[PDB]
Scaffold this active site. Structure first.
Site, mmCIF file in Angstrom:
data_model
loop_
_atom_site.group_PDB
_atom_site.id
_atom_site.type_symbol
_atom_site.label_atom_id
_atom_site.label_comp_id
_atom_site.label_asym_id
_atom_site.label_seq_id
_atom_site.Cartn_x
_atom_site.Cartn_y
_atom_site.Cartn_z
ATOM 1 N N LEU A 123 -3.021 -25.242 26.502
ATOM 2 C CA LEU A 123 -2.186 -24.391 27.368
ATOM 3 C C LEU A 123 -0.918 -23.968 26.629
ATOM 4 C CD1 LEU A 123 -2.828 -26.608 30.421
ATOM 5 C CD2 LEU A 123 -3.477 -24.160 30.251
ATOM 6 N N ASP A 124 -0.805 -22.679 26.311
ATOM 7 C CA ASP A 124 0.224 -22.255 25.350
ATOM 8 C C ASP A 124 1.062 -21.086 25.862
ATOM 9 O OD1 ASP A 124 1.741 -21.435 23.218
ATOM 10 O OD2 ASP A 124 0.011 -21.362 21.789
ATOM 11 N N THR A 125 2.255 -21.386 26.391
ATOM 12 C CA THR A 125 3.068 -20.311 26.978
ATOM 13 C C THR A 125 3.661 -19.384 25.862
ATOM 14 O OG1 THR A 125 5.077 -21.680 27.013
ATOM 15 C CG2 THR A 125 3.657 -21.767 28.920
ATOM 16 N N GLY A 126 3.619 -19.854 24.627
ATOM 17 C CA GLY A 126 4.017 -19.013 23.488
ATOM 18 C C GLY A 126 2.991 -18.024 23.001
ATOM 19 N N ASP B 37 7.789 -22.704 24.713
ATOM 20 C CA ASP B 37 6.500 -22.745 24.068
ATOM 21 C C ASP B 37 5.781 -24.072 24.208
ATOM 22 O OD1 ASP B 37 4.386 -22.532 22.437
ATOM 23 O OD2 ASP B 37 5.500 -21.824 20.672
#
Ligand SMILES: COC(=O)N[C@H](C(=O)N[C@H](C(=O)N[C@@H](Cc1ccccc1)[C@H](O)C(=O)N1CSC(C)(C)[C@H]1C(=O)NCC(C)(C)C)C(C)(C)C)c1ccccc1
Lengths: 116, 116
Positions: free
Chosen positions: B31-34, A32
């Site tokens: 930028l939020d991969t979660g 995350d």
């Protein structure tokens, strides 16, 4: 490894976490880039351990209750690399069993985002 | 670009967002991969657009007042590519006016997480 980014599939990793209050356990954690700090489920900690109150802002809102802060560092071992990540402190989910690897841990395994 | 990760600095980019309800506007987004879905601020929209209520799970838990869903697709132009990302729908933050690029948008620009 390279982790593709897919709305339908949460990017996750198995991580061995040692809270230093219990035998280390391997959990599945969400990766995350949006988390300032890592979140460990309260389950991985022994019943009695001192944890500090803390305030956390998430998308659902600001909470003074859901999360605690560790007292001892948490060590995290990733599948690919033999050296442990040492987090001086991170968050503890007292409520919803969440496991989240944030930018504190990602920094230490030299994780990056790549936008071609 | 390669974007490094650091607990003390949010990974952000400038993007041009077109909600198709007024002209395209510049925002600075996390930028939020979660994030399963992108979040754009209600401030982008005029005072009387129609937006559907939606429930979202965040760190503050389940919120059902905080986010709406767009009714039209949202186009997003990133500094380093000419073709816009087109999102069939995304979340609209009516409370804190956050801008978060999630995995729906990251997939369209072939974004990856890389852990050495
Ligand atoms: C059914 O459709 C959904 O509810 N999608 C949810 C989602 O993507 N929620 C995102 C979300 O909050 N993701 C966050 C991770 C997360 C996911 C589900 C529950 C709790 C936390 C995000 O990557 C982050 O760190 N954010 C978004 S807001 C923020 C302050 C910049 C930061 C943050 O929360 N930081 C707090 C800590 C360090 C405790 C994570 C949205 C609202 C931004 C789209 C969801 C549901 C179950 C598991 C994973 C995701």
């Amino acid at each position: 490894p390279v982790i593709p980014l897919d709305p339908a599939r949460r990017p996750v990793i198995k991580a061995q976490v040692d809270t230093q209050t219990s035998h280390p356990k391997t959990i599945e954690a969400l990766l995350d880039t949006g988390a300032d700090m890592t979140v460990i489920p309260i389950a991985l900690f022994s019943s009695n351990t001192p944890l500090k109150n803390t305030s956390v802002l998430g998308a659902g809102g600001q909470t003074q209750d859901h999360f605690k802060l560790t007292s001892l560092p948490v060590l995290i071992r990733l599948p690919f690399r033999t050296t442990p990540i040492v987090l001086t402190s991170c968050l503890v989910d007292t409520k919803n069993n969440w496991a989240i690897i944030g930018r504190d841990a990602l920094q230490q395994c030299q994780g990056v985002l790549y936008l071609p």
